[PDB]
Ligand binder design. Structure first.
Ligand code: RLI
Length: 195
């Protein structure tokens, strides 16, 4: 229920007015990349602030699955992106899910490297422009999500702040010291590497 998330955003990502929910959007995507260090073989995560107030997260995990999911008749990726808790990682006895980020984004770009192919899909408020599609060949595996947050959901503090992201990435590095984490700001060229 993408509308259900937009109806109750605080219940998923926190306060939508003081900047904290805005930055929790990034941390949800980063938490999904971090989980692949154990669930897959992720060794490197790159978090970039773009000049148009979007953030991307690139990992070298397994890649969000791309095959057609039988019940929905669309790619698994699309299901993961549009259906709350979908994807085989939610344990109702054990966070939020990339579908929450998609629901609360004006636009989301998804690029997956998996099974020899590059795959791409663009969403607007959680609605795909086209089915996931193959764009080329690759030997890599991984997932890149770049999102532009919805100004219908996020108010007041709406711009991403380098220092808020660096502080949480520095904590995450301490607890995941085998993963290379890079933060880059395209606006001014600032970067930090952890550990
Ligand atoms: C942008 C950073 C990001 O979100 N990376 C992400 N990588 C992955 C891999 C993500 C994800 C979300 S549910 C999910 N399920 C599966 C289930 C099975 C397999 C497999 O059998 O191979 C891989 C992933 N995988 S989310």
């Amino acid at each position: 229920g993408l509308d259900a998330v937009r109806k109750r955003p605080g219940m998923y990502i926190g306060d939508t007015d003081d900047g904290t929910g805005l930055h929790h959007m990034v941390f949800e995507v980063v938490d999904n990349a971090i989980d692949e260090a154990l669930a897959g073989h992720c060794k490197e995560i790159i978090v970039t602030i773009h000049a148009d107030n979007s953030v991307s997260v690139q990992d070298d995990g397994r890649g969000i699955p791309t095959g057609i999911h039988p019940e929905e008749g669309v790619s698994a990726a699309e299901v993961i992106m549009t259906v709350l808790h979908a994807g085989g990682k939610f344990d109702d006895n054990s966070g939020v899910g990339v579908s929450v980020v998609n629901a609360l984004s004006q636009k989301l770009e998804l690029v997956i490297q998996r099974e020899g192919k590059i795959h791409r899909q663009i969403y607007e408020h959680g609605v795909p422009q086209a089915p996931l599609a193959v764009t080329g060949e690759t030997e890599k595996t991984g997932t890149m999500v770049r999102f532009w947050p919805s100004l219908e959901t996020f108010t007041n503090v709406t711009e991403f702040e380098y220092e808020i992201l660096a502080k949480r990435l520095r904590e995450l590095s301490f607890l995941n010291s085998g993963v290379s984490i890079r933060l880059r700001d395209k606006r001014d060229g600032k970067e930090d590497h952890f550990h």
